[PDB]
């Protein structure tokens, strides 16, 4: 829906990363790198970077009710 | 003469005769409609 | 008495039992009930 604020098997907050990979995937550079760059070691936490859906942005189009 | 009125024909969501074939991306989401759904179905009561 | 608001132009008024069931701003007649008074509290959990 939105970014987990933690990676759920180890707990290395990942919440704070999510602007930075948007941003480096932009550049050009690849998935696998744009990880490395951020000092995402671990694979449990490059699942919940990598293959997180932002739902949310879909969510906002639709008009406040108040 | 004048044209008389046999009764109501539930339409089909999605299909020609659909208020929301038209409409297009922009006025989809005032309708509160969601651009996934692609319809196929019917709407009673 | 009891805070409502408008599904289609978001005006706040209220509504006894008599009145009928519609915003006053564009005759919209679909209704939703104001946030209550108390506070709520969670968790975080
Ligand atoms: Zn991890
Ligand atoms: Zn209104």
Same mark, same amino acid.
């Given at each position: 829906?939105?970014?987990?604020?933690?990676?759920?098997?180890?707990?290395?907050?990942?919440?704070? &990363?999510?602007?930075?990979?948007?941003?480096?995937?932009?550049?050009?550079?690849?998935?696998?790198?744009?990880?490395?760059?951020? &000092?995402? &070691?671990?694979?449990?936490?490059? $699942?919940?970077?990598?293959?997180?859906?932002? @739902?949310?942005? &879909?969510? @906002? $189009?639709?008009?406040?009710?108040? | 003469?004048?044209?008389?009125?046999?009764?109501?024909? =539930?339409?089909?969501?999605?299909?020609?005769?659909?208020?929301?074939?038209?409409?297009?991306?922009?006025?989809?989401?005032?309708?509160?409609?969601? =651009?996934?759904?692609?319809?196929?179905?019917?709407?009673?009561? | 008495? /009891?805070?409502?608001?408008?599904?289609?132009?978001?005006?706040?008024?209220?509504?006894?039992?008599?009145?009928? /069931?519609?915003?006053?701003?564009?005759?919209?007649? /679909?209704?939703?009930?104001? %946030?209550?008074?108390?506070?709520?509290?969670?968790?975080? %959990?």
């Amino acid at each position: 829906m939105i970014i987990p604020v933690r990676c759920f098997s180890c707990g290395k907050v990942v919440g704070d &990363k999510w602007d930075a990979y948007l941003r480096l995937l932009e550049e050009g550079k690849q998935e696998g790198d744009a990880l490395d760059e951020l &000092k995402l &070691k671990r694979y449990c936490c490059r $699942r919940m970077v990598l293959t997180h859906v932002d @739902l949310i942005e &879909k969510f @906002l $189009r639709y008009n406040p009710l108040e | 003469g004048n044209k008389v009125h046999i009764g109501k024909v =539930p339409i089909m969501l999605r299909s020609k005769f659909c208020s929301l074939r038209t409409l297009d991306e922009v006025d989809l989401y005032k309708m509160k409609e969601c =651009p996934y759904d692609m319809g196929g179905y019917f709407v009673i009561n | 008495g /009891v805070k409502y608001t408008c599904g289609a132009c978001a005006h706040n008024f209220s509504l006894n039992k008599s009145d009928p /069931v519609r915003c006053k701003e564009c005759g919209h007649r /679909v209704i939703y009930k104001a %946030r209550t008074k108390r506070m709520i509290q969670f968790d975080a %959990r």
